[PDB]
Amino acid sequence: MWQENKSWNAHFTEHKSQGVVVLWNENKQQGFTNNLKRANQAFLPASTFKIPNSLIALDLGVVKDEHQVFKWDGQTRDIATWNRDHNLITAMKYSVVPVYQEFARQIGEARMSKMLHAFDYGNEDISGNVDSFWLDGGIRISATEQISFLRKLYHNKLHVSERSQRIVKQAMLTEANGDYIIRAKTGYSTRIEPKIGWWVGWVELDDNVWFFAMNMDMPTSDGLGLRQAITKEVLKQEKIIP
């Protein structure tokens, strides 16, 4: 059910990088990875936690819908796209942390713990601040655990309303053309070592769905584009995308 394909390491080696890419063939129920050990190594989810955070916020009514505007708090921050009004779609697209920190505070630690346990999400640990535990707290999730969570979300099997799951899957939309649809979420963990970058999601084809979860060492923010580039090179080699 799991298979190691160490040939994908050349895509990491070419860009002087190191990480793991995990693929899941939904039709055949088979998994593939270049490093089974790192595939099961649990890291801070960083901004990939915006997927479960969105689900909980929508199911609890903290977020009314994907169109509700969340005004900029006026604090000018270092990322320019953060200093503006956002809805759920654009907050996920630009990884607007302060918007989701506001969501987490309204959710509260008690409901956040209960929901993450219902989601079977990682180690289900929210130790630290309720509005930063996915950035510098105790929550840890592996690439294979991201796949298991994403597979439940795809099939609407999470312990939330179907509506919340459909809205979040819409907000995860990243790329779409005549060949494939990518619903995914980026992540960048910097507060706690090791500094890593995430990209988790799935590729929808006409007759199949390929779930993917990747993470890689990210000492500097200059290599952040390699998350999508290395993943797409693996997808191209596997004939998943042209």
Ligand X SMILES: Nc1cc(S(=O)(=O)O)cc2cc(S(=O)(=O)O)cc(O)c12
Planar angle of CA 96, 98, 101, nearest 5 degrees: 115
Helix (H) or strand (E) holding 4: strand 2-4
Site residues (CB under 5 A) for Cl ion, limited to 165-204: 170, 173
H helices, E strands: number in the chain: 9, 7
Site for Cl ion in 205-234 (CB under 5 A): 223
* Exposure string over 213-236, b if 16+ CB within 10 A, otherwise e: bbbbebeeeebeebbbebbbbbbe
Show the tokens assigned to 10: 């050349």
79 binds ligand X (CB under 6 A): yes
Amino acid identity, residue 224?
A: L
Give CA separation, 78 vs 96, 129, 177, 218, in Å.
Answer: 11, 22, 33, 19
- Residues 133-162 vs a second copy: string with x where CB under 8 A? -----------------------------x
What are phi and psi for residue 142, nearest 5 degrees? -100, 170
Sole binder of ligand X in the list 19, 45, 187, 201 (CB under 6 A): 187
Among residues 188, 204, 223, 237, which is the contact residue for ligand X, using CB under 6 A? 188
Consult the annotation and say whether 47 binds a ligand: yes
Q: Between 14 and 65, name the residue whose CB sits nearer to a second copy.
A: 65
CA distance 73 to 84: 9
Catalytic residues: 47
Q: Which of 181, 192, 224, 229 binds a second copy (CB under 8 A)?
A: 181
Binding residues for ligand X, rule: CB under 6 A, are: 47, 78-79, 95, 97, 186-188, 221, 224
Binding residues for a second copy, rule: CB under 8 A, are: 85, 89-90, 93, 162-163, 166-167, 169-170, 173-178, 181, 204, 206-207
Binding residues for Cl ion, rule: CB under 5 A, are: 17, 170, 173, 223
What residue numbers does the annotated binding site for a beta-lactam cover? 47, 50, 95, 227
